[PDB]
Amino acid sequence: RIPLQIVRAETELSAEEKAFLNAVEKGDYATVKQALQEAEIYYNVNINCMDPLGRSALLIAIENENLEIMELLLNHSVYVGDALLYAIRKEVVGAVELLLSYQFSEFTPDITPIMLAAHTNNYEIIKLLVQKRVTIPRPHQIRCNCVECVSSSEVDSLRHSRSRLNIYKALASPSLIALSSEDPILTAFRLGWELKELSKVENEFKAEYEELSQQCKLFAKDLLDQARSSRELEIILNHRDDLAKLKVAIKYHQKEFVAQPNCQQLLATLWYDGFPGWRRKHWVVKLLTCMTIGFLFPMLSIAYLISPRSNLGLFIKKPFIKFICHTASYLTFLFMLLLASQHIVRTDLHVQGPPPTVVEWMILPWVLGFIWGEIKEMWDGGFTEYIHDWWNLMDFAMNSLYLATISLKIVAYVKYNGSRPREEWEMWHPTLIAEALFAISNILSSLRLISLFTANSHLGPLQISLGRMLLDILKFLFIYCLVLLAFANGLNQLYFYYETRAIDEPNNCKGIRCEKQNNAFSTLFETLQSLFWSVFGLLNLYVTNVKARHEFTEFVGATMFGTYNVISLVVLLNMLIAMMNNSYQLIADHADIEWKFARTKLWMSYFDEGGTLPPPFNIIPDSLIQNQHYQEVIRNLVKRYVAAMIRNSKTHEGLTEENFKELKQDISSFRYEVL
Amino acid sequence: TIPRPHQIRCNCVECVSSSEVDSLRHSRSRLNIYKALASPSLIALSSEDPILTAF
Amino acid sequence: RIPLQIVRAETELSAEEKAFLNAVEKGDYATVKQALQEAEIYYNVNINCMDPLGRSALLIAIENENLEIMELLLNHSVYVGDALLYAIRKEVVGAVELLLSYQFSEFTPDITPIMLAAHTNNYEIIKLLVQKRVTIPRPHQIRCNCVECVSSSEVDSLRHSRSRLNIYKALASPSLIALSSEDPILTAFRLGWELKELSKVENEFKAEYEELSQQCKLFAKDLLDQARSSRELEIILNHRDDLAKLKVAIKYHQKEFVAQPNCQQLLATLWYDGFPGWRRKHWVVKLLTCMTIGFLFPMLSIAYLISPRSNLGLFIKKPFIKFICHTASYLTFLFMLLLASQHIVRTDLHVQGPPPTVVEWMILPWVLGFIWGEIKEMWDGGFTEYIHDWWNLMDFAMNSLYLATISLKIVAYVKYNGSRPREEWEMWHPTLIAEALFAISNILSSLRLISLFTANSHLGPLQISLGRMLLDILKFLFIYCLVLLAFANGLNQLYFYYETRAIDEPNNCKGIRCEKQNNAFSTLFETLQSLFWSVFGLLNLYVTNVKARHEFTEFVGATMFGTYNVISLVVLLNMLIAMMNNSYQLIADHADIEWKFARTKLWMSYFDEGGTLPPPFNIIPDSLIQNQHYQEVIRNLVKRYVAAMIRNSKTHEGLTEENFKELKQDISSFRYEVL
Ligand SMILES: CC(C)CCC[C@@H](C)[C@H]1CC[C@H]2[C@@H]3CC=C4C[C@@H](OC(=O)CCC(=O)O)CC[C@]4(C)[C@H]3CC[C@]12C
Numbered sequence A, C: 001r002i003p004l005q006i007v008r009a010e011t012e013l014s015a016e017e018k019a020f021l022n023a024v025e026k027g028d029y030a031t032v033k034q035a036l037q038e039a040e041i042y043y044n045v046n047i048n049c050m051d052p053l054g055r056s057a058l059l060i061a062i063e064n065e066n067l068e069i070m071e072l073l074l075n076h077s078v079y080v081g082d083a084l085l086y087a088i089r090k091e092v093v094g095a096v097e098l099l100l101s102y103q104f105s106e107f108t109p110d111i112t113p114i115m116l117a118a119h120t121n122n123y124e125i126i127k128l129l130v131q132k133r134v135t136i137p138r139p140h141q142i143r144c145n146c147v148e149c150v151s152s153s154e155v156d157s158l159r160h161s162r163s164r165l166n167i168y169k170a171l172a173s174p175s176l177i178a179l180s181s182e183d184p185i186l187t188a189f190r191l192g193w194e195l196k197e198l199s200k201v202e203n204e205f206k207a208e209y210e211e212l213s214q215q216c217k218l219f220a221k222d223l224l225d226q227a228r229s230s231r232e233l234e235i236i237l238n239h240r241d242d243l244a245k246l247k248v249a250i251k252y253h254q255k256e257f258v259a260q261p262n263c264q265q266l267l268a269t270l271w272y273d274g275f276p277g278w279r280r281k282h283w284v285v286k287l288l289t290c291m292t293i294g295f296l297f298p299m300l301s302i303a304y305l306i307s308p309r310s311n312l313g314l315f316i317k318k319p320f321i322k323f324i325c326h327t328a329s330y331l332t333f334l335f336m337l338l339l340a341s342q343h344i345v346r347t348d349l350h351v352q353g354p355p356p357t358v359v360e361w362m363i364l365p366w367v368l369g370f371i372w373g374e375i376k377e378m379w380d381g382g383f384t385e386y387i388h389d390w391w392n393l394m395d396f397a398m399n400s401l402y403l404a405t406i407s408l409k410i411v412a413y414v415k416y417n418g419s420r421p422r423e424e425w426e427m428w429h430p431t432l433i434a435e436a437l438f439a440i441s442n443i444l445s446s447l448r449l450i451s452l453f454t455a456n457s458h459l460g461p462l463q464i465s466l467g468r469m470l471l472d473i474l475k476f477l478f479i480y481c482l483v484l485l486a487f488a489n490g491l492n493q494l495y496f497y498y499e500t501r502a503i504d505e506p507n508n509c510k511g512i513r514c515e516k517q518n519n520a521f522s523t524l525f526e527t528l529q530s531l532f533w534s535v536f537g538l539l540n541l542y543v544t545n546v547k548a549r550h551e552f553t554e555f556v557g558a559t560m561f562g563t564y565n566v567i568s569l570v571v572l573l574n575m576l577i578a579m580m581n582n583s584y585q586l587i588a589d590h591a592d593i594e595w596k597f598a599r600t601k602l603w604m605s606y607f608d609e610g611g612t613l614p615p616p617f618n619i620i621p622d623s624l625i626q627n628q629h630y631q632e633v634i635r636n637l638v639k640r641y642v643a644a645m646i647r648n649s650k651t652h653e654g655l656t657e658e659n660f661k662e663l664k665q666d667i668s669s670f671r672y673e674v675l
Numbered sequence B: 001t002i003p004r005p006h007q008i009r010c011n012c013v014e015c016v017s018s019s020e021v022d023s024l025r026h027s028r029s030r031l032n033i034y035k036a037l038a039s040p041s042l043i044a045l046s047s048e049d050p051i052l053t054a055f
């Protein structure tokens, strides 16, 4: 039971001011005139009177989009400050032209008319403003330590951040870009890249910068979709500041630009150089052509080596043929690797240092070619780009393992000369180490074949999606490792008092890899291995029993093991499944764009003339006119895009408002004529 | 003025009698009073600490 | 290169007819008059001329909602057939009144004006039509063999079905129900039930009948939400054609009606009879009150038996107290069942026919009370309702098992007198069979405790959701069983040649329940058991080996087992998981309504005065004025609902059309006045 009052009271204006505001709002070309005369003579009305909701007479007239009252008030020298911004926001060209013809605010004090027009993206008002030689400030580098930036960040961080965001939002306007830039596509590429990089430095305002970068990418794509001819498309794609613009787009991660249908058709035409009407043929004949071209890989290569200008020697220069030949060569290498571990070719397993066999002699040139190709690619093409592939890491590991295997084999051959039973060799015998490294490198080289899946229309998107989920798998791995370490520490602390020697165990075997598992929690390493193997159910339940009858200790150990099993197998795995599902739901939307970007990147690596020969055979020893053409095509594209966007801007609300205003104007004119 | 309701757990005779005669009317009246009190415009107009009042 | 022509040409009308139609469409009170005069005199115009798009002049005027031309044409005796339907569909009251004042069509020939008005759900037009003593046909029973129905279904099934659907769609109109029914709530209940039952007989038009039933349910609920007082709510809920209307709603499956907040408050007030301000107390004190009331269950019952009118004897008549007492009694029975299988109370396991122990003597009265209560409930309350619970099946199985156990114990006690080692008893000893049946009944009785979860705010919805998924689990069971039978047949056919006797096996054990598993696929029963147990990984891999060296047979058996494992564990289980997820996604939306319906059904079973005592103690031996009140409250509710729906019918499109038409009319009037 407490009354309600007004705490922050507003100082009301007099009846004269209220009547003046009412007349201004209603619209009376004569009553407002006589009110202004009275204000001039007797000062009964304040010319600068303000509505309690901060709405002066000029603002009321602007919101009423009637220009006669505004012109009269301008002639009467009313306070005109901060009215051009209201006109711009209301998007009224006539009023904007009128004010351009010469406390409390709804706009921050850093906003300029040109910036506000750019935020609105109105081409007609932006052009009108830019016609009067306006400028826009440009911000400092993302990581800048200059005194002016440091002082600004030290006095008003909120103001600094808001000003930077406003400037970038103005600069990212498609209409401003089209009006003021000479290379709109390149400008959009660079601006999108800069905004994407800035979003992670200003982590608080991340979504705004993300949306600005998306806007720039959409503008570039939509500008590309306005091409009407193959000649125009080639002029756009081949412009050098052979497909220089496409390479720049790939560098700047313009996936929607690259995956556009007109670009994909050009790329496919370049890809199928020697097979006109490839999509006309049946899948059976295409498959048979693939097999026949694959089997002739040793030829077409010797021909290219002995006669590049010959008809046969020019066949391997086509991208699809080159890809098929490289694939066939890699498959042959893998088949020899398979042949290495067979009974047919490898015998006499009793020699300490064995000379290389025929299969190893055949294998060596492939390894040399792989290493030479990796080094040559890394030298020619950029060192910093070589590491942003995530497959070159596998290549490096595989080649390092092969080099270590060769070195260990040579060392063993030099050091050892004779025979000895394998059962009495030491643990660290060079032959044993070389065999282990060879097996690991075989696994890696066989797993490398995944990267060829992106060339297929059915397996490529699936491979991209799996590669996208791998990161979140890596995210869960951390929590799992922490839980595993905690429980391993506890179990080892409990059980380390009951260690036994291998002598007293059956068969003199110690650990969990024996037929009767024992000493599962005697050391930290063994405890970690046991807790890892219990995830798949390969650890038996009698490993929690000690030889003595310590029932309390055995029960505590069993309860520890059961709690670990519950936490690991009932909770963490199901949470992993749930978040896998959530990730795949979002990933499945953009699978096509990512797959086409990946396939374009894969195709573009076979276009150049470097590294034509497969690894087995690769170790044997005017500008102005182009600028005018680009400018003409850009003019046409910008005109078409602007016209299309203007015709799209026709909306029901705008049309209804325009018709209502026009009908009101005509009715007023007819009433005045009658009167 | 606007009436203000009793504590969430109140045993006063007036609350008990009201809940014993017309529970539907009592609940509807309480909900209407709280819906009126939770108005942003009313808060901004009549409160001196709108943030604390909203909290 | 083939030209395009017109195949189904329309016979065009003459220039006179085209001019007449143009004048009618444009609107000319004098030009149309002189055209009609010319048609009368020289017959230059056809009064019945039709637009090529089937649009006569009267239809054009109706779509123009100008009544002067329609009245003039009616005075001129133009073909007026099938125009009232167009007026009704356009929903123009003035035109409808005008035509009511006295080839090609867009309406099927079975549609009447009243049916069309009911389809539109316009209260103003429905009332206007019903004021003139109109009727609507009513259809025959869902399963009717009368000659007229058989002949109609034998001549035109499409026409018959369309007519039935149209009649039901007209009858299911909320405005028609409110206008013409004396008990709208009961009418909505019955109509929704009938439509729901009809949807599964007309399986082709299932969705239409489902939507009609949903419409009826929504109407009944929305009518209920218009109560403003507890007295009105009690009048509505207690009306008998003690909560008769609520019981009818429960019988007709009106979940949204029952789960409404005003009804739930009344039910909670009835439920907490002896605890005013129950929700005011803390959860700790509420819990402690629950425990104390539970422990005093033997008392409050003897008090009710020896003095029902006493202050102590009237406590058990409250529903919450009765529920707590029954729960405590059941928990005591389960605790005695737990005590049955302990070392403290049961000894001397060597007697063939043993006399009952003290725990069994204590157990027997509970079983007798359970059986008596089941029989009494089944007699008093309806036999056909007793089977639609799906818990009474568990009750019946449990009580049958207890009866069989008692009978077998009595038979064994009568037949056997002496002692014998248990190891030399036969397979079918009555004591062994009775023990097995007792254990199974113990499992069932312990599992019965699930039904008490619906009383809790956290476990109830979860239990309802699981019970909803059980049906789809049952759906997958069929496919799994078929696959299992196929593979069992194949494996038994392959392996039945290598059966071995138990004598030659170690420990003289035969089957897969031995320590060394053998004869896994020797018989069909054993093959089925092995293939069942392989789902959980409890079958070892050496069971596919025969004693002889038949490598082809062993490999074929291993491949069969591997194919079965892949199909069962990699495909079917993952599909089950996927469809579980899909089912839960839809189930999670309406969990609250279903849970509240279930809790209301559970609460209502403790309101009546029959079966007050728990099973241990239950074996010891005017209408007119109510009608006027209901009619008044129904009048108020219908008026409020109609007013609310009318105020909700205000839409932007309708308001804009009305304002445009009114402005056009006023402009025309002003122009005529000026002229
Ligand atoms: C699962 C087992 C059988 C793998 C055996 C290894 C190789 C025989 C496979 C592994 C990946 C395969 C490659 C995966 C995808 C492609 C792309 C494919 O190109 C297309 O499909 C082009 C037409 C299109 O775009 O659809 C040509 C075959 C090739 C190189 C495949 C050749 C055969 C490869 C090397």
Ligand SMILES: CC(C)CCC[C@@H](C)[C@H]1CC[C@H]2[C@@H]3CC=C4C[C@@H](OC(=O)CCC(=O)O)CC[C@]4(C)[C@H]3CC[C@]12C
Residues within 6 Å of the ligand: C327, C331, C449, C452, C453, C455, C456, C457, C458
């Ligand atoms: C998992 C183990 C511990 C089960 C042991 C068996 C019994 C001790 C449990 C099983 C189900 C329980 C019942 C489940 C739900 C309820 C409803 C509950 O009622 C409310 O919560 C009312 C208030 C509300 O609506 O939230 C009162 C206890 C009771 C009967 C529980 C009493 C104790 C029961 C019989």
Ligand SMILES: [Ca+2]
Residues within 6 Å of the ligand: A374, A391, A392, A395
């Ligand atoms: Ca590489």
Ligand SMILES: [Ca+2]
Residues within 6 Å of the ligand: C374, C391, C392, C395
């Ligand atoms: Ca029952």
Ligand SMILES: [Zn+2]
Residues within 6 Å of the ligand: A140, A141, A144, A145, A146, A147, A148, A149
């Ligand atoms: Zn700076």
Ligand SMILES: [Zn+2]
Residues within 6 Å of the ligand: B006, B007, B010, B011, B012, B013, B014, B015
């Ligand atoms: Zn109070």
Ligand SMILES: [Zn+2]
Residues within 6 Å of the ligand: C140, C141, C144, C145, C146, C147, C148, C149
């Ligand atoms: Zn009939």
